[PDB]
């Protein structure tokens, strides 16, 4: 992914949550995909909105192509004061 990308910025909630699920990485033979988006959460109310099926390319400006699922999760957990995501819509 490099042609039609979307840059998303979201501030975490009171509990330090964004309201979205991730699947894949380097340890999993599948890219990082946003599997689920919870309603009324930062991921659901941000502009542009983070949608289900979006392929994650960057997390806070870092390339996560060679990173495992656990590392990807911990990188998102280190942006809590906003989370930056570069995704490919699907």
């Amino acid at each position: 992914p490099h042609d039609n990308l979307v840059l998303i910025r979201m501030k975490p909630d009171e509990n330090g949550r964004f309201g979205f699920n991730v699947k894949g990485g380097y340890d999993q033979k599948m890219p990082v995909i946003v599997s689920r988006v919870a309603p009324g959460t930062p991921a659901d109310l941000c502009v542009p909105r983070l949608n289900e099926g979006d392929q994650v390319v960057l997390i806070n400006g870092r390339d996560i192509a060679e990173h495992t699922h656990d590392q990807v999760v911990l990188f998102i957990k280190a942006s809590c004061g906003e989370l930056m995501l570069l995704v490919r819509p699907n």
Partner: peptide
Amino acid sequence: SKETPL
């Protein structure tokens, strides 16, 4: 297939 909420 691992899934994690954030």
